[PDB]
Amino acid sequence: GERKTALEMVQAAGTDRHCVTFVLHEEDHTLGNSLRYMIMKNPEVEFCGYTTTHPSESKINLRIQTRGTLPAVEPFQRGLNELMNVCQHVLDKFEASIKDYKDQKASR
Amino acid sequence: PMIYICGECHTENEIKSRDPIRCRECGYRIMYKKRTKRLVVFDAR
Amino acid sequence: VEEMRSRVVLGEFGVRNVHTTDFPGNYSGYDDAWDQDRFEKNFRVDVVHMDENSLEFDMVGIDAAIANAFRRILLAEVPTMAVEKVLVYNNTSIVQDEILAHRLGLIPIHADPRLFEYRNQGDEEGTEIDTLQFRLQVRCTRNPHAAKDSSDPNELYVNHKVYTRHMTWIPLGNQADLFPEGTIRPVHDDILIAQLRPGQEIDLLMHCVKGIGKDHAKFSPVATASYRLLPDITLLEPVEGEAAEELSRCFSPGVIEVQEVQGKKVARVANPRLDTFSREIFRNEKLKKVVRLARVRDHYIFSVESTGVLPPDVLVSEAIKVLMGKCRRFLDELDAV
Amino acid sequence: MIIPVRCFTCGKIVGNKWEAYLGLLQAEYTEGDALDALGLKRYCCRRMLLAHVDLIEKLLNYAP
Ligand SMILES: [Zn+2]
Ligand SMILES: [Zn+2]
């Protein structure tokens, strides 16, 4: 949707699909670090690292280098999905716990 | 109706062209202009 | 041949390691490919307190990256409403105009930011959709009914101190419906805005817009939202005989509960969570060898304290949803190619 | 000059505890007990009231 508040991908020297650098705009260490943690769980990626280009700017660079087969854009799109699944589960669990505690406290 | 408050009397004197700049009810020689209601915009940052 | 899977051990001259050994390939067999069911099974949330303006849930079984993401969302990405523009018709106060505007920006408004929207760039006017307007108009006069007294409230006082009570909401559009009479108001009615003397007057219109605590702190919805790993304390040896009390004094007092099992006194670790890390045992030179204090690996303790705009549990919910929104925005922008 | 509205390091709102602080000190309470009875736990907030110098009361004494 947004042509540049979001993704700009730079395929490496030789446009290796297995080595991509994603530029994520308007992002700081929050999404960078959580998404790097979620992408490291994939045994098909050999190098994942994020970095902020400069303090004055608001953008991060992820670097995903996967193994021989997959195009390194599936690891990214799967780390996103797993992180969103974890957030949904945490939200459900937290709301259920808050409700249970409110009941336990309002009864007594 | 340009008002000026005296320095220590605090009487509203209206001064113009060609007239001296002393204050009535006293004789001091310093008079502060008055704040009128005019709209100004400030940012809360 | 000794594994310690759950604690961050620690001495005095420094902590031992910075790892958690729960990632892919981090062990011979203890390898990871993000089993989602193992997460959903080992995760549990526990809330220690929930007054209004406080929460202390536990959030057991999550990594430091996700916990830090949640903490940084509450401080800088959950949206709030706050004064952005100030129109000053007259101001004969001692407090300056720019300083008054600043002081007015840092006052928290009780409007919920989820019913509003962001003003488009250059939308100076604003509309019922994105703005709330409030008016402070106060003048100080001597009270005619006063004796020869000197208390500032009794005399020289109709409005000596301008408070947040003096601020009145001007319903901008159809906002009178939607918002009942007392709903949109400043959160605190006692915040001292200025001080006046007879003949001095304040008169202004404040405009409140939506925004996140990232582009200015005034829009931030929590006092603090930090977290701390759950401490762990282990008595390697049975402490007794008046060394138990010296042990119980080298810790936050509730942590080591000295029971009396026999005629002698035994110290026991009653509640490890109360401990503040002060490392005062390490000055004892005889009991630094008896106790090992470390941190539990992925067992956190959170503490969210809102200013009053939204309840803390709603704040945490909206933080988790903001992280989900980031993830979904990037997923859907990826799907755009 | 006047009480800061929010504590600088944290942001906690301390601009409504000035008169309450002054009232608990007139009642005989130490500055420690007084800052406790107001809810100022962490010392970043406690320094915001403990070391405040109210100079709005000395500027509000020269003629209008
Ligand atoms: Zn005069
Ligand atoms: Zn503070």
Every domain of chain B and the residues it spans: 2-45
Backbone φ and ψ for C143, nearest 5 degrees, come out as -85, 130
Beta-carbon contacts of C148 under 8 Å, excluding residues fewer than 6 positions away, are: none
- Domain holding D52, by residue range, is 1-64
Residue with tokens 């390194």: A72
Method of elucidation: cryo-EM
Between CA A83 and CA A36, with CA C226 as vertex, the angle to 5 degrees is: 25
Q: Which one of C91, C104, C191, C276 would you mutate to disrupt binding with D, by most D Cβ within 10 Å of its Cβ?
A: C191
- The residue among C271, C244, C273 whose CA lies nearest residue C259 is C244
* Helices C64-76 and A29-39, axial angle in degrees (round to 10): 160
Chain D partners (3+ C-beta pairs within 8 A):
B, C
Q: The tokens of A93 are what?
A: 């669990």
- The structure tokens listed for A65 are 């280098």
Is the Cα torsion angle C215, C218, C220, C226 positive or negative in sign?
positive
The closest of D48, C294, C66 to A83, measured between CA atoms, is C66
Q: Do C36 and A85 touch (CB under 8 A)?
A: yes
Q: Is D7 known to sit in a ligand binding site? A: yes
What's the 3-state SS for chain A? CCCCCCEEEEECCCCCCCEEEEEEECCCHHHHHHHHHHHCCCCCEEEEEEEECCCCCCEEEEEEEECCCCCCCHHHHHHHHHHHHHHHHHHHHHHHHHHHHHHHHHHC
Contact list in B for residue D63 (CB cut-off 8 A) is: 8, 10
Residue ranges of the annotated binding site of B are: 6, 9, 23, 26
Q: What is the CATH number of the domain that holds D9?
A: 1.10.10.60
Tell me which residue of C170, C164, C30, C36 sits closest to C109, measured CA to CA.
C164
How many Å apart are CA C47 and CA A98, to the nearest integer? 7
Query: Cα–Cα distance between D39 and D46 in angstroms, integer?
Result: 9
Number of structural domains found in chain D? 1
Q: What are residue C3's phi and psi, to 5 degrees?
A: -105, 135
Q: How far apart are CA C44 and CA C55, in angstroms?
A: 16
Distance CA C312, CA C307 (A): 9
Distance between CA atoms of residues A41 and C144, nearest Å:
77
B2-45 sits in which CATH class? mainly beta
8 Å CB contact of C84 and B41: no
Tokens at residue A25, please? 């705009």
User: Are C195 and D10 inside 8 Å of each other by CB?
Assistant: no
Tokens linked to C337 = 């190619």
Please state which CATH number belongs to domain C77-223.
2.170.120.12
